[PDB]
């Protein structure tokens, strides 16, 4: 849009908030719409744009390259969203791109791994504390220890 | 109240354009005007940038036949609109909304 | 015993009307607070700017919600995954424009859940039990946090995270579907097995207790006072309960084991439970439901729509309608 | 109905010359087109351009003009801007930009076409499906 | 726990339903009007 | 049985189908907003209870 | 000199730069030389809301009021052209840059005003004769204060004016006449004006520092209801350069 | 008419409260042993 | 009078909750 | 007595031609030579009184001038629209495909 | 800000130091069994 | 642990009929009435609110939004017997998407 | 807000008589002979 004559800084977006710039809540100039929520990404083809006080409106203007562009556009369309049968793009995208990101592989399968991990560490160390103290196979019934407690009430 | 008569929709053109009406499924319902073919010649756009059958660009009027209106013609994009909104309803009738305070949002009958 | 061994003893007593414990030492305080700030934001809180664009979305009673449109909602998009407790607010004003509540709630329970599930564990070896009702509990706790933490990091927010209100789960639940298709991913699909098995043979186990209970009553009288609480002999005949079902079906189809049957039981939903959990914990990343649009075509090329494609239609009426002043570029990425 | 020979005769050049494809072509440019232009083109639109699409209608009121095997094999090697103004080579995949867009390295003339070939027959097949986006899904 | 020996029954008779009922009522009668007003 | 007796046809039945099924749900959310209604919400209550 | 990541989250980058005490010479204007302002920052420290005259209509004040909206209500990075006129005033012709903020402040009692402050469009000229900037000049001057929203936003019933929905669909049979000021959506265009006060000047690098004050309307929301008048008072900094 | 939208309320619960508390009484009193 | 409606309600639950457990008939061993 | 300017402009000959005071910038793919470096400069130099006047933008090409002659009968002016021309709508107007 | 900030770390850390103190009391002895686990 | 238990088996066993059982049978009684489009559409204070002040929100109304989509979007396939046409113009949507 | 203004007694009514209902039988049986 800045190539087609935008002023990108001075543009307001429907909201107030301006459509591709606007500020954290401490002030550093970020990217608007959505992408409010990841002004911590940090990556060498946005960096040389970044001054003290976030993105600089100057080096915007003036010092994008053209293999910036290639890199933004890049990134944009290898987004990690896809299908598990792999079918590259939000859930309403037509067949066509035979994509998952290597990062949705990777941090979908170690969640699940993990996850049934903590269900085994809680399965043996409760058998752990249960064996240890004698009662993993289940209550004796002539020393049932909750009949030798007081009622609760 | 009152039957406010048969609303007949032309285009600039003079071609008699048709309401498609809402059916029972929908809370809501577009205006979408076609020709006795069912070739779309009129709407109500949601999006206007692209708009190109907004009865503004298509001179729609709307004609009155029998009823509180009969002989009557409106031009006014509008009123016209108004009356497009209500054809999706079938036939326009004038209600009392007053004496009930009715809230403009349909009921069942004794047979629903 | 001086005081430490004093407090110690009280903690972990077998003998308190409800169990504290070590897991209940964090657990009462973090649910305390998890449950006020709910109880108040829910009737008192002014609207929350859910998604970053000074749009505040009214939740409480008081602000005309009913208890259906009711919620507590989520923090704001500007925040992000950002901590925001009560004292990186400026004020309290600042503090619920933004919905700092919906963070401590979120966060106090999740932690209060936590100790819940360890003080289940905790208590079943104070009483010389078995220890793995925690493991069962484990499946609706994972699914808390799968809609409160692990998909707000995976999306990059919060703000994305369930509502804590009935009308703002079916947002989230809406939305969900757009975005991941969930109908039609194979975890979810566990799931539901889970939940309508669950049902399934809770009513079916239920009923067949029920059904070959041993007459010990009159008809003037309820036949629970048939049982008497502590009684050794037990109160059903299970050899005519598995005489019936394994008829209704066929005899190997049948649990003639109760200790079989009750691992069933708890098994079927507690594992279906973990896969919708993980369902959710692993769409969090964008591994989405199985996309089958426009996957039949005919000899010249045209497509030959399937249900799958009805579906496709749906989902992108929600994706169009959802947060409709939030987005200013084509694509929807996180 | 079926892919005949018809669907698969499209424009060769802007002066009144047609080429019919082969199955095996239209399979290889349908494969081709995926490899190296789908991430951005997929239905036909644009996704890091939604203004400029990949219709027939749009691609003959392109300068020069792209509605025709030559129009697009040369755009593949030499990409301009939809008035022809400027040459966008840098970032846009071509042969003159295999070395930064690296999957147009193994592309060959006889690939051109075959993409090219996709280009023109798909919305032949498809009506406006082919470039019309989420709307026509 | 020991049970409080300063535990009574209470009783209401018939006649005494009826007395109350009837006082309720008739109260009901009386102050309908002012509550609509 | 009850449902696309009340509707127009059999046509509004839920189709025999895994995907047909996901459709129907779907269907009775953006017309009917059949999450909004008491007796699904006791339905959902009794399921998960 | 301070980088992106000694500045991240401390507040500091919705800060205008300030100059020290020393700072109080004078900036010569060579009237044959043109003149840009590289960079006009403004930082708001009080936005103060009239309240709306009870009645009595006697002077209604303005109050003050707390931000909601968090460290993101600064004005920066702005540019424009700085003419030397006849009389030897100079005027500030504002082109471009970060010239907006949506902000949202909270009345006693809990009522929300957002508004747009903005400088848009601003030009603001000094007093005639102005041979240097010094602790003495100062600039007024008038700027363009849109509609809040925009033409696309949509309310949440799906109205808006250059999309969405033209009735209330939910109501389909109520009388529209009642509705029409909800229904209709109308994009707001009105003037503020604001005074800058010159505090500080450094002779040597062109760099001002002062105070402002500006007055402006709050948000109407497309046409629904009344705006508010709003002062923004705080500081600035600008850096004077032949261009 | 235009009556006063609480009496109602107020009329249904100054008659069933008391009613109600009535009624507990004397049943359990019917119930207690003869 | 809908907001004092709901919270009243919630609070009689909360109530009920209080007398369910520390108010229950106890379970006894016969 | 209210009225949704955006309606009221498609009655105009906004709504059947480009309008160069008003017109988002992807109008003027719809004919041959004007995107985007004319587009960009019409845009720029917006507003004008009448259609000729586009012909005056300076440092054109001889070309590029009789390109725009081609076309005029593809375009109008009316007056500015607030609505349509801020929020630098006319460079991004919301609307994709 | 500051007061809440340091009373809710000094509630939080108090907690805390009860759950690791507590659990590092001799916590396998407290059950009905087998208390020797040393 | 939960403050209650369970001290009947025979009352614990009925109670797990009584639960599955009794909710499917509500959920029934639910789609009887959607025979009929008698549902739990709206809540009209809600709508009355909504329509006259364009700053309320909540989440019923964003639902109802997600709705209107559904049905605009997925009606002509899935009604093909109803010959919708809905020109793009029409169609809801919100920015960008 | 444009509630139903019958809501009120609706739900008093839909909660006490029920409830007094089960008050009166939990007494009565309280009362009977141990
Ligand atoms: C014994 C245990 C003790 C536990 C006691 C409780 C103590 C509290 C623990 C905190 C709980 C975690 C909450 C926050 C998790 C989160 O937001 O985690 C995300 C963080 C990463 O944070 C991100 O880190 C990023 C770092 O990238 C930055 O740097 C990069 C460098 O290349 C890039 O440049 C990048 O672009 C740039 O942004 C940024 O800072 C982001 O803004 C930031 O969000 O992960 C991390 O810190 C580490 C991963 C945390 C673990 C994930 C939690 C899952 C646990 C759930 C288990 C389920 C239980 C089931 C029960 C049944
Ligand atoms: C009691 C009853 C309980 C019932 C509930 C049970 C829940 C599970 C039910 C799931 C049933 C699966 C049906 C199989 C569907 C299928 O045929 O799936 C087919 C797919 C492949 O689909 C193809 O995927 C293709 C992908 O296209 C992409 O890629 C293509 C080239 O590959 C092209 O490039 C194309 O352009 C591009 O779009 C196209 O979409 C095709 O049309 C499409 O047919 O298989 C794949 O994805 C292969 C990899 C994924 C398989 C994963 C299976 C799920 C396992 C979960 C069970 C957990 C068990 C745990 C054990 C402990
Ligand atoms: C960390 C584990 C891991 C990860 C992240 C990947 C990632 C990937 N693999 Mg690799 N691989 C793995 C392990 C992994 N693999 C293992 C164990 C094998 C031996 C079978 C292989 C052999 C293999 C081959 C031959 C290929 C891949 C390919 C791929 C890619 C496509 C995957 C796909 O389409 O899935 C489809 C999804 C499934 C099949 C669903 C898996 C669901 C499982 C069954 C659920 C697990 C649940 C849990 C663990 C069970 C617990 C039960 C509970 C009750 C306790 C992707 C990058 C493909 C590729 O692109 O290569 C270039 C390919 O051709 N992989
Ligand atoms: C069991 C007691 C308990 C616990 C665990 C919490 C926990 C929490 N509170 Mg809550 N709170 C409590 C009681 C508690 N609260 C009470 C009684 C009140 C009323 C006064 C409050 C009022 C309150 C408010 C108003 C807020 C919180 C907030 C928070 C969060 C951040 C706390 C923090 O920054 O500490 C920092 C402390 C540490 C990092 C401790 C370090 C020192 C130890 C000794 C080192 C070891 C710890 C290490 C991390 C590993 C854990 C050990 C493990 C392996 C066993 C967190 C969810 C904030 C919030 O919810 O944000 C969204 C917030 O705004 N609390
Ligand atoms: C929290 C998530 C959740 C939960 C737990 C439920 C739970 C329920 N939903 Mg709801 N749903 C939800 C979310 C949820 N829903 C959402 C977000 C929507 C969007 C609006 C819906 C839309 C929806 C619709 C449209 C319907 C439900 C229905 C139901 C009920 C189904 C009961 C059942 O088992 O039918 C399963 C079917 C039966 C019990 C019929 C008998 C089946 C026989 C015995 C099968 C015999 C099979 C045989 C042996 C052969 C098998 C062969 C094999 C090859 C397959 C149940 C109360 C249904 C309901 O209300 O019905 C009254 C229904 O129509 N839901
Ligand atoms: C007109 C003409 C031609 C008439 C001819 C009729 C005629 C005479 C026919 C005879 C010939 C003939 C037999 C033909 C057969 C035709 C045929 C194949 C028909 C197909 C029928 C059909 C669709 C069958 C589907 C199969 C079916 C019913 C499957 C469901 C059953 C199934 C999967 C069960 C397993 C599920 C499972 C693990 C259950 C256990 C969980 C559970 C219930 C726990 C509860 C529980 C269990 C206990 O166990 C006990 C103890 C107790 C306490 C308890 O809590
Ligand atoms: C400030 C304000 C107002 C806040 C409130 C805001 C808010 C959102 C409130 C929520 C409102 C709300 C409650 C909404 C839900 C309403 C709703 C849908 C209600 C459903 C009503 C209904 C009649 C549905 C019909 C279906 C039905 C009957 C469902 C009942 C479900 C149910 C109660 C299931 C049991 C759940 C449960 C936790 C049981 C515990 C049982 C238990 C102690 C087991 C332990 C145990 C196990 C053993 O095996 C043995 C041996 C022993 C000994 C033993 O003990
Ligand atoms: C072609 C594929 C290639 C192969 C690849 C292999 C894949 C791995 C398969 C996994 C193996 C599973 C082992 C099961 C053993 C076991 O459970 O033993 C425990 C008992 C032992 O059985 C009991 O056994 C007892 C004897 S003993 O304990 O075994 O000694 C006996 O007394 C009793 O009557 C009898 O019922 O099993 C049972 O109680 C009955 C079976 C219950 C089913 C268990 C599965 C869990 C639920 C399903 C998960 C839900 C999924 C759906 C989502 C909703
Ligand atoms: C805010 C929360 C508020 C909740 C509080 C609940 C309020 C409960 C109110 C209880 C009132 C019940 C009255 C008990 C009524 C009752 O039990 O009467 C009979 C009762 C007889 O008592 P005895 O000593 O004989 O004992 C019998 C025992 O069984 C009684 O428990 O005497 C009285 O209670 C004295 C009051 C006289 C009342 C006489 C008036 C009746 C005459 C008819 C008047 C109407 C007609 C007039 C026509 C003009
Ligand atoms: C860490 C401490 C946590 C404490 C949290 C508080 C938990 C409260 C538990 C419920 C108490 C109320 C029980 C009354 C009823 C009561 O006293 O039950 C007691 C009853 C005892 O059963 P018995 O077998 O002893 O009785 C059988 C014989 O009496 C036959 O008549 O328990 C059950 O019936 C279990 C099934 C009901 C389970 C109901 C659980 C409902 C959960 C709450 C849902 C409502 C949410 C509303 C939110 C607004
Ligand atoms: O925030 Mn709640 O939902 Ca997850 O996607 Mn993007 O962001 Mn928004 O749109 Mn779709
Ligand atoms: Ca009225
Ligand atoms: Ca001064
Ligand atoms: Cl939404
Ligand atoms: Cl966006
Ligand atoms: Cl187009």
Same mark, same amino acid.
């Given at each position: 849009?800045?190539?087609?004559?935008?002023?990108?800084?001075?543009?307001?977006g429907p909201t107030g908030?301006?459509?591709?710039?606007?500020?954290?809540?401490?002030?550093?100039?970020?990217?608007?719409?959505?992408?409010?929520?990841?002004?911590?990404?940090?990556? !060498?083809?946005?960096?040389?744009?970044?001054?003290?006080?976030?993105?600089?409106?100057?080096?915007?203007?003036?010092?994008?390259?053209?293999?910036?562009?290639?890199?933004?556009?890049?990134?944009?369309?290898?987004?990690?969203?896809?299908?598990?049968?792999?079918?590259?793009?939000?859930?309403?995208?037509?067949?066509?791109?035979?994509?998952?990101? !290597?990062?949705?592989?990777?941090?979908?399968?170690?969640?699940?791994?993990?996850?049934?991990?903590?269900?085994?560490?809680?399965?043996?160390?409760?058998?752990?504390?249960?064996?240890?103290?004698?009662?993993?196979?289940?209550?004796?019934?002539?020393?049932?220890?909750?009949?030798?407690?007081?009622?609760?009430? | 109240?009152?039957?406010?008569?048969?609303?007949?929709?032309?285009?600039?053109?003079?071609?008699?354009?048709?309401?498609?009406?809402?059916?029972?499924?929908?809370?809501?319902?577009?205006?979408?005007?076609?020709?006795?073919?069912?070739?779309?010649?009129?709407?109500?756009?949601?999006?206007?940038?692209?708009?190109?059958?907004?009865?503004?660009?298509?001179?729609?009027?709307?004609?009155?036949?029998?009823?509180?209106?009969?002989?009557?013609?409106?031009?006014?994009?509008?009123?016209?609109?108004?009356?497009?909104?209500?054809?999706?309803?079938?036939?326009?009738?004038?209600?009392?909304?007053?004496?009930?305070?009715?809230?403009?949002?349909?009921?069942?009958?004794?047979?629903? | 015993?001086?005081?430490?061994?004093?407090?110690?003893?009280?903690?972990?007593?077998?003998?308190?009307?409800?169990?504290?414990?070590?897991?209940?030492?964090?657990?009462?305080?973090?649910?305390?607070?998890?449950?006020?700030?709910?109880?108040?934001?829910?009737?008192?809180?002014?609207?929350?700017?859910?998604?970053?664009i000074?749009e505040?979305?009214?939740?409480?009673?008081?602000?005309?919600?009913?208890?259906?449109?009711?919620?507590?909602?989520?923090?704001?998009?500007?925040?992000?995954?950002?901590?925001?407790?009560?004292?990186?607010?400026?004020?309290? &004003?600042?503090?619920?424009?933004?919905?700092?509540?919906?963070?401590?709630?979120?966060?106090?329970?999740?932690?209060?859940?936590?100790?819940?599930?360890?003080?289940?564990?905790?208590?079943?070896?104070?009483?010389?039990?078995?220890?793995?009702?925690?493991?069962?509990?484990?499946?609706?706790?994972?699914?808390?946090?799968?809609?409160?933490?692990?998909?707000?990091?995976?999306?990059?927010?919060?703000?994305?995270?369930?509502?804590?209100?009935?009308?703002?789960?079916?947002?989230?639940?809406?939305?969900?579907?757009?975005?991941?298709?969930?109908?039609?991913?194979?975890?979810?699909?566990?799931?539901?097995?889970?939940?309508?098995?669950?049902?399934?043979?809770?009513?079916?186990?239920?009923?067949?207790?029920?059904?070959?209970?041993?007459?010990?009553?009159?008809?003037?009288?309820?036949?629970?006072?048939?049982?008497?609480?502590?009684?050794?002999?037990?109160?059903?005949?299970?050899?005519?309960?598995?005489?019936?079902?394994?008829?209704?079906?066929?005899?190997?189809?049948?649990?003639?084991?109760?200790?079989?049957?009750?691992?069933?039981?708890?098994?079927?939903?507690?594992?279906?439970?973990?896969?919708?959990?993980?369902?959710?914990?692993?769409?969090?990343?964008?591994?989405?439901?199985?996309?089958?649009?426009?996957?039949?075509?005919?000899?010249?090329?045209?497509?030959?729509?399937?249900?799958?494609?009805?579906?496709?239609?749906?989902?992108?009426?929600?994706?169009?309608?959802?947060?409709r002043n939030?987005?200013?570029?084509?694509?929807?990425?996180? | 109905?079926?892919?005949?020979?018809?669907?698969?005769?499209?424009?060769?050049?802007?002066?009144?010359?047609?080429?019919?494809?082969?199955?095996?072509?239209?399979?290889?440019?349908?494969?081709?087109?995926?490899?190296?232009?789908?991430?951005?083109?997929?239905?036909?639109?644009?996704?890091?351009?939604?203004?400029?699409?990949?219709?027939?209608?749009?691609?003959?009121?392109?300068?020069?003009?792209?509605?025709?095997?030559?129009?697009?094999?040369?755009?593949?090697?030499?990409?301009?801007?939809?008035?022809?103004?400027?040459?966008?080579?840098?970032?846009?995949?071509?042969?003159?930009?295999?070395?930064?867009?690296?999957?147009?390295?193994?592309?060959?003339?006889?690939?051109?076409?075959?993409?090219?070939?996709?280009?023109?027959?798909?919305?032949?097949?498809?009506?406006?499906?082919?470039?019309?986006?989420?709307?026509?899904? | 726990?020991?049970?409080?020996?300063?535990?009574?029954?209470?009783?209401?008779?018939?006649?005494?339903?009826?007395?109350?009922?009837?006082?309720?009522?008739?109260?009901?009668?009386?102050?309908?009007?002012?509550?609509?007003? | 049985?009850?449902?696309?007796?009340?509707?127009?046809?059999?046509?509004?039945?839920?189709?025999?189908?895994?995907?047909?099924?996901?459709?129907?749900?779907?269907?009775?959310?953006?017309?009917?907003?059949?999450?909004?209604?008491?007796?699904?919400?006791?339905?959902?209550?009794?399921?998960?209870? | 000199?301070?980088?992106?990541?000694?500045?991240?989250?401390?507040?500091?980058?919705?800060?205008?730069?300030?100059?020290?005490?020393?700072?109080?010479?004078?900036?010569?204007?060579?009237?044959?030389?043109?003149?840009?302002?590289?960079?006009?920052?403004?930082?708001?420290?009080?936005?103060?809301?009239?309240?709306?005259?009870?009645?009595?209509?006697?002077?209604?004040?303005?109050?003050?009021?707390?931000?909601?909206?968090?460290?993101?209500?600064?004005?920066?990075?702005?540019?424009?052209?700085?003419?030397?006129?006849?009389?030897?005033?100079?005027?500030?012709?504002?082109?471009?840059?970060?010239?907006?903020?949506?902000?949202?402040?909270?009345?006693?009692?809990?009522?929300?005003?957002?508004?747009?402050?903005?400088?848009?469009?601003?030009?603001?000229?000094?007093?005639?004769?102005?041979?240097?900037?010094?602790?003495?000049?100062?600039?007024?001057?008038?700027?363009?204060?849109?509609s809040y929203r925009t033409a696309n936003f949509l309310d949440?019933?799906?109205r808006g004016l250059a999309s969405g929905?033209?009735?209330?669909?939910?109501?389909?049979?109520?009388?529209?006449?009642?509705?029409?000021?909800?229904?209709?959506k109308?994009?707001?265009?009105?003037?503020?004006?604001?005074?800058?006060?010159?505090?500080?000047?450094?002779?040597?690098?062109?760099?001002?520092?002062?105070?402002?004050?500006?007055?402006?309307?709050?948000? &109407?929301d497309m046409?629904?209801?009344?705006?508010?008048?709003?002062?923004?008072?705080?500081?600035?900094?600008?850096?004077?350069?032949?261009? | 008419?235009?009556?006063?939208?609480?009496?109602?309320?107020?009329?249904?619960?100054?008659?069933?409260?008391?009613?109600?508390?009535?009624?507990?009484?004397?049943?359990?009193?019917?119930?207690?042993?003869? | 009078?809908?907001?004092?409606?709901?919270?009243?309600?919630?609070?009689?639950?909360?109530?009920?909750?209080?007398?369910?457990?520390?108010?229950?008939?106890?379970?006894?061993?016969? | 007595?209210?009225?949704?300017?955006?309606?009221?402009?498609?009655?105009?000959?906004?709504?059947?031609?480009?309008?160069?005071?008003?017109?988002?910038?992807?109008?003027?793919?719809?004919?041959?030579?004007?995107?985007?470096?004319?587009?960009?400069?019409?845009?720029?130099?917006?507003?004008?009184?009448?259609?000729?006047?586009?012909?005056?933008?300076?440092?054109?090409?001889?070309?590029?001038?009789?390109?725009?002659?081609?076309?005029?009968?593809?375009?109008?002016?009316?007056?500015?629209?607030?609505?349509?021309?801020?929020g630098?709508?006319?460079?991004?107007?919301?609307?994709?495909? | 800000?500051?007061?809440?900030?340091?009373?809710?770390?000094?509630?939080?850390?108090?907690?805390?130091?009860?759950?690791?103190?507590?659990?590092?009391?001799?916590?396998?002895?407290?059950? !009905?069994?087998?208390?020797?686990?040393? | 642990?939960?403050?209650?238990?369970?001290?009947?088996?025979?009352?614990?066993?009925?109670?797990?009929?009584?639960?599955?059982?009794?909710?499917?049978?509500?959920?029934?009684?639910?789609?009887?009435?959607?025979?009929?489009?008698?549902?739990?559409?709206?809540?009209?204070?809600?709508?009355?609110?909504?329509?006259?002040?364009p700053?309320?929100?909540?989440?019923?109304?964003?639902?109802?939004?997600?709705?209107?989509?559904?049905?605009?979007?997925?009606?002509?396939?899935?009604?093909?017997?109803?010959?919708?046409?809905?020109?793009?113009?029409?169609?809801?949507?919100?920015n960008?998407?």
């Amino acid at each position: 849009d800045q190539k087609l004559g935008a002023n990108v800084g001075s543009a307001q977006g429907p909201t107030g908030l301006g459509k591709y710039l606007m500020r954290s809540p401490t002030g550093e100039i970020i990217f608007g719409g959505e992408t409010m929520r990841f002004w911590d990404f940090r990556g !060498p083809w946005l960096e040389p744009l970044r001054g003290p006080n976030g993105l600089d409106l100057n080096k915007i203007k003036n010092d994008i390259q053209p293999w910036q562009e290639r890199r933004a556009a890049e990134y944009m369309t290898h987004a990690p969203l896809g299908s598990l049968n792999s079918v590259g793009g939000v859930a309403t995208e037509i067949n066509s791109v035979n994509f998952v990101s !290597p990062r949705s592989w990777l941090a979908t399968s170690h969640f699940v791994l993990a996850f049934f991990f903590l269900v085994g560490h809680l399965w043996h160390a409760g058998r752990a504390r249960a064996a240890a103290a004698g009662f993993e196979k289940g209550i004796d019934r002539e020393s049932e220890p909750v009949l030798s407690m007081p009622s609760l009430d | 109240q009152a039957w406010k008569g048969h609303a007949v929709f032309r285009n600039k053109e003079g071609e008699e354009l048709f309401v498609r009406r809402m059916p029972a499924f929908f809370e809501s319902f577009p205006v979408i005007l076609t020709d006795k073919n069912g070739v779309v010649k009129a709407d109500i756009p949601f999006r206007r940038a692209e708009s190109k059958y907004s009865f503004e660009q298509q001179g729609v009027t709307v004609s009155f036949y029998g009823g509180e209106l009969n002989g009557q013609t409106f031009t006014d994009p509008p009123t016209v609109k108004s009356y497009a909104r209500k054809a999706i309803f079938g036939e326009i009738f004038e209600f009392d909304t007053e004496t009930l305070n009715s809230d403009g949002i349909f009921r069942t009958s004794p047979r629903g | 015993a001086n005081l430490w061994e004093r407090f110690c003893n009280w903690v972990t007593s077998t003998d308190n009307r409800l169990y504290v414990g070590w897991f209940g030492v964090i657990m009462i305080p973090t649910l305390l607070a998890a449950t006020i700030c709910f109880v108040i934001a829910f009737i008192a809180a002014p609207p929350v700017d859910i998604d970053g664009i000074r749009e505040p979305v009214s939740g409480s009673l008081l602000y005309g919600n009913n208890i259906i449109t009711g919620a507590v909602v989520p923090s704001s998009n500007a925040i992000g995954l950002h901590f925001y407790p009560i004292w990186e607010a400026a004020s309290l &004003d600042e503090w619920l424009y933004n919905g700092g509540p919906y963070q401590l709630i979120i966060f106090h329970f999740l932690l209060g859940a936590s100790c819940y599930m360890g003080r289940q564990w905790e208590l079943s070896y104070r009483l010389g039990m078995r220890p793995w009702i925690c493991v069962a509990y484990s499946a609706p706790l994972a699914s808390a946090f799968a809609v409160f933490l692990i998909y707000p990091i995976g999306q990059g927010s919060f703000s994305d995270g369930m509502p804590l209100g009935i009308s703002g789960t079916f947002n989230f639940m809406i939305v969900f579907q757009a975005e991941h298709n969930i109908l039609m991913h194979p975890f979810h699909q566990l799931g539901v097995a889970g939940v309508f098995g669950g049902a399934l043979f809770c009513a079916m186990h239920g009923s067949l207790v029920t059904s070959s209970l041993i007459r010990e009553t009159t008809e003037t009288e309820s036949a629970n006072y048939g049982y008497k609480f502590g009684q050794e002999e037990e109160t059903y005949n299970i050899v005519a309960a598995h005489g019936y079902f394994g008829r209704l079906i066929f005899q190997y189809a049948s649990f003639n084991n109760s200790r079989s049957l009750h691992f069933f039981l708890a098994a079927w939903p507690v594992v279906g439970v973990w896969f919708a959990a993980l369902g959710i914990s692993t769409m969090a990343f964008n591994l989405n439901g199985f996309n089958f649009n426009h996957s039949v075509i005919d000899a010249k090329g045209n497509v030959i729509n399937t249900w799958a494609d009805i579906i496709n239609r749906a989902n992108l009426g929600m994706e169009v309608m959802h947060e409709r002043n939030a987005h200013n570029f084509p694509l929807d990425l996180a | 109905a079926e892919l005949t020979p018809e669907v698969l005769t499209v424009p060769l050049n802007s002066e009144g010359k047609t080429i019919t494809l082969t199955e095996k072509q239209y399979l290889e440019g349908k494969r081709l087109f995926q490899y190296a232009c789908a991430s951005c083109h997929v239905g036909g639109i644009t996704k890091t351009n939604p203004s400029l699409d990949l219709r027939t209608e749009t691609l003959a009121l392109a300068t020069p003009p792209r509605d025709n095997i030559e129009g697009l094999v040369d755009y593949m090697k030499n990409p301009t801007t939809y008035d022809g103004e400027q040459e966008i080579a840098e970032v846009h995949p071509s042969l003159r930009s295999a070395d930064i867009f690296p999957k147009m390295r193994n592309l060959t003339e006889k690939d051109l076409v075959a993409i090219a070939g996709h280009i023109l027959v798909e919305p032949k097949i498809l009506g406006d499906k082919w470039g019309g986006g989420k709307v026509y899904y | 726990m020991e049970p409080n020996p300063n535990r009574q029954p209470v009783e209401l008779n018939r006649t005494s339903l009826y007395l109350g009922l009837l006082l309720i009522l008739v109260l009901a009668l009386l102050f309908s009007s002012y509550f609509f007003n | 049985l009850i449902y696309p007796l009340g509707q127009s046809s059999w046509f509004f039945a839920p189709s025999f189908g895994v995907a047909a099924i996901f459709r129907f749900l779907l269907f009775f959310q953006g017309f009917h907003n059949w999450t909004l209604n008491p007796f699904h919400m006791m339905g959902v209550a009794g399921v998960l209870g | 000199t301070l980088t992106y990541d000694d500045i991240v989250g401390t507040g500091l980058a919705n800060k205008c730069p300030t100059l020290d005490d020393t700072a109080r010479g004078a900036y010569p204007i060579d009237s044959s030389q043109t003149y840009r302002i590289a960079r006009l920052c403004l930082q708001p420290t009080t936005f103060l809301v009239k309240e709306e005259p009870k009645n009595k209509r006697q002077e209604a004040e303005f109050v003050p009021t707390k931000l909601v909206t968090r460290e993101t209500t600064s004005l920066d990075q702005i540019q424009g052209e700085l003419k030397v006129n006849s009389d030897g005033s100079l005027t500030f012709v504002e082109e471009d840059g970060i010239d907006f903020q949506p902000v949202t402040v909270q009345m006693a009692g809990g009522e929300r005003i957002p508004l747009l402050f903005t400088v848009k469009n601003l030009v603001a000229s000094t007093q005639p004769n102005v041979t240097s900037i010094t602790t003495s000049t100062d600039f007024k001057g008038e700027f363009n204060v849109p509609s809040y929203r925009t033409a696309n936003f949509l309310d949440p019933k799906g109205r808006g004016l250059a999309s969405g929905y033209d009735s209330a669909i939910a109501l389909p049979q109520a009388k529209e006449e009642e509705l029409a000021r909800a229904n209709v959506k109308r994009f707001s265009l009105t003037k503020g004006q604001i005074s800058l006060n010159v505090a500080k000047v450094d002779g040597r690098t062109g760099e001002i520092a002062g105070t402002f004050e500006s007055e402006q309307l709050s948000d &109407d929301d497309m046409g629904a209801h009344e705006p508010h008048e709003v002062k923004i008072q705080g500081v600035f900094y600008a850096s004077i350069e032949p261009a | 008419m235009e009556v006063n939208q609480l009496g109602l309320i107020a009329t249904a619960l100054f008659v069933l409260v008391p009613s109600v508390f009535l009624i507990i009484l004397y049943v359990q009193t019917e119930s207690q042993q003869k | 009078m809908e907001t004092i409606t709901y919270v009243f309600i919630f609070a009689c639950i909360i109530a009920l909750f209080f007398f369910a457990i520390f108010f229950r008939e106890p379970p006894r061993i016969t | 007595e209210l009225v949704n300017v955006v309606d009221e402009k498609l009655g105009t000959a906004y709504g059947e031609k480009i309008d160069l005071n008003n017109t988002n910038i992807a109008a003027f793919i719809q004919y041959r030579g004007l995107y985007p470096t004319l587009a960009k400069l019409i845009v720029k130099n917006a507003p004008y009184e009448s259609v000729e006047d586009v012909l005056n933008i300076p440092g054109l090409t001889e070309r590029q001038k009789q390109i725009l002659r081609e076309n005029l009968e593809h375009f109008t002016v009316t007056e500015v629209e607030t609505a349509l021309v801020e929020g630098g709508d006319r460079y991004n107007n919301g609307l994709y495909k | 800000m500051e007061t809440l900030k340091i009373t809710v770390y000094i509630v939080v850390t108090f907690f805390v130091l009860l759950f690791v103190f507590g659990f590092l009391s001799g916590d396998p002895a407290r059950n !009905p069994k087998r208390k020797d686990l040393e | 642990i939960f403050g209650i238990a369970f001290s009947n088996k025979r009352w614990l066993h009925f109670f797990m009929l009584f639960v599955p059982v009794t909710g499917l049978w509500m959920s029934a009684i639910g789609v009887v009435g959607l025979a009929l489009n008698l549902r739990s559409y709206d809540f009209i204070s809600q709508e009355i609110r909504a329509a006259e002040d364009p700053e309320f929100e909540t989440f019923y109304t964003k639902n109802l939004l997600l709705n209107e989509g559904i049905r605009a979007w997925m009606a002509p396939q899935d009604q093909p017997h109803e010959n919708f046409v809905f020109p793009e113009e029409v169609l809801p949507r919100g920015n960008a998407l």
